[PDB]
Design an enzyme around this catalytic site. Structure first.
Site, short mmCIF file in Angstrom:
data_model
loop_
_atom_site.label_atom_id
_atom_site.label_comp_id
_atom_site.label_asym_id
_atom_site.label_seq_id
_atom_site.Cartn_x
_atom_site.Cartn_y
_atom_site.Cartn_z
N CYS A 1 0.69 -1.07 -0.11
CA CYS A 1 -0.21 -0.24 -0.49
C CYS A 1 0.64 1.39 -0.01
O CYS A 1 1.85 1.19 -0.93
CB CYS A 1 -0.97 -0.22 1.15
C1 LIG Z 1 -2.90 1.53 3.07
N1 LIG Z 1 -3.67 1.10 3.57
C2 LIG Z 1 -4.15 2.77 2.81
C3 LIG Z 1 -5.66 2.21 2.78
C4 LIG Z 1 -6.54 2.91 2.59
C5 LIG Z 1 -5.97 3.90 2.04
N2 LIG Z 1 -7.38 4.86 1.17
O1 LIG Z 1 -6.72 5.91 0.18
O2 LIG Z 1 -8.36 4.70 1.35
C6 LIG Z 1 -5.14 4.48 1.92
C7 LIG Z 1 -4.16 4.13 2.93
#
Ligand SMILES: */C=N\c1ccc([N+](=O)[O-])cc1
Ligand SMILES: */C=N\c1ccc([N+](=O)[O-])cc1
Ligand SMILES: [Cl-]
Ligand SMILES: [Cl-]
Lengths: 226, 226
Positions: free
Chosen positions: A100
């Site tokens: 992520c």
């Molecule tokens: C890495 N975790 C993460 C989860 C969701 C989002 N988002 O923008 O929804 C960003 C980062």
């Protein structure tokens, strides 16, 4: 014992870490570390409380380092102590990995310069200022660097690492022991498959975070330019 | 606020819990509880230390209760305090759910009598003595009871619960925010797709645990017969 380390920081997205942790902890002759500035409680973005097991100074040389994502990456991208630790460990690690937005931390550390990489879809535009070649694929491998997107990417790439560190039969045995055969009830896990109205709602909810992260990214890129 | 509770017990398989926890904690107007006999540290089977947030006595009436699996279920199947709590909460919960061997705990509590259910493939033979109708499917729904198998089943069914508790667009938005689009590098997550040699290795490694669990299951079934 293969030494595997996860960076555990305040406001981490805990599933980015706890997924691959449970898979890799299933393997023989592995030791898994949860690393922060000191051992002790660290609170994830959901409020779940985890426990770091070792400090930067006490951490052994790692064979695998994994950087999870989450809201807390913005602070990490300007934490000189954390960035120096990541650079030190990456120099000799067999595998450098992220999930992520964890790849933005690798970027701030200078480890994506000239490398193919991905990150969470809503923040993908921030890879190029950090020197990366942005790639729109779920798992991207460039040498010993693996970057992945999605909440099972660390699970999926942990099985790949099990097959390379041990063998394919070992990775398959772990997959079977965990009965891992996902089947999501919806198909909205990518901006290319989700309904347009859903993509809009998700982009609107991330707009303030993206705006702040861009400011941070530009400062981090200035440090790399020096 | 929708009240969602996970049972957190020593030797839990932490991913059974931390997966759905992160998804459901993404929803608006939900409160998530990690329940044990008292608040405080609880160690998962991998050594990861989690923190229970509330006791049995202090837990509010739950809308959703989720029972994870793991090595620790054997003790739970003969814990009268835990079984009584589960029965009390299930009486009024909108959804009763379990992951992996968590369904054996529901069985010991009497909640599977006459119900279709699944569990981890290596322990599936233990459902019938607990009164269940065993079903070889990844997610099984019988009324308000959902039982699932595999390390993303709680993630997959958490999206289903998001769609019913809220709406489909909300579930799709959460899936997109988490970029959840799994793609495992191997196809050995079921005994019907894994190589025969791998199935043998996995069955051999579980044999001692299965033998012990059968003894426990027979005692639990005797209590239900009374
Ligand atoms: C890495 N975790 C993460 C989860 C969701 C989002 N988002 O923008 O929804 C960003 C980062
Ligand atoms: C539910 N956790 C769990 C994981 C693996 C096994 N196994 O037999 O391999 C049982 C239970
Ligand atoms: Cl994913
Ligand atoms: Cl699964």
């Amino acid at each position: 014992a293969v030494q595997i380390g996860f960076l555990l920081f305040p406001e981490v997205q805990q599933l980015d870490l706890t997924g691959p942790h449970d898979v890799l902890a299933s393997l023989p002759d592995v030791q898994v570390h949860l690393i922060w500035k000191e051992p002790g409680p660290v609170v994830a973005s959901s409020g779940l409380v985890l426990q770091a097991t070792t400090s930067f100074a006490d951490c052994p040389p790692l064979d695998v380092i994994c950087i999870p994502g989450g809201t807390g990456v913005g602070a990490l991208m300007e934490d000189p102590q954390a960035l120096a630790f990541i650079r030190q460990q990456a120099a000799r690690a067999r595998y450098v990995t992220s999930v992520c937005t964890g790849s933005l931390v690798l970027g701030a550390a200078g480890l994506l310069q000239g490398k193919r990489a991905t990150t969470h879809w809503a923040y993908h535009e921030l890879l190029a200022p950090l020197g990366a070649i942005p790639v729109h694929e779920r798992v991207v491998r460039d040498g010993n660097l693996l970057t992945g997107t999605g909440i099972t990417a660390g699970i999926d790439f942990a099985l790949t690492l099990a097959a390379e560190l041990f063998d394919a039969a070992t990775a398959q045995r772990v997959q079977l022991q965990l009965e891992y055969a996902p089947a999501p009830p919806f198909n909205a896990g990518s901006p290319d498959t989700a309904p347009a109205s859903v993509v809009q709602q998700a982009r609107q909810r991330a707009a303030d975070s993206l705006h702040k992260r861009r400011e941070i990214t530009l400062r981090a890129a200035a440090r790399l330019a020096a």
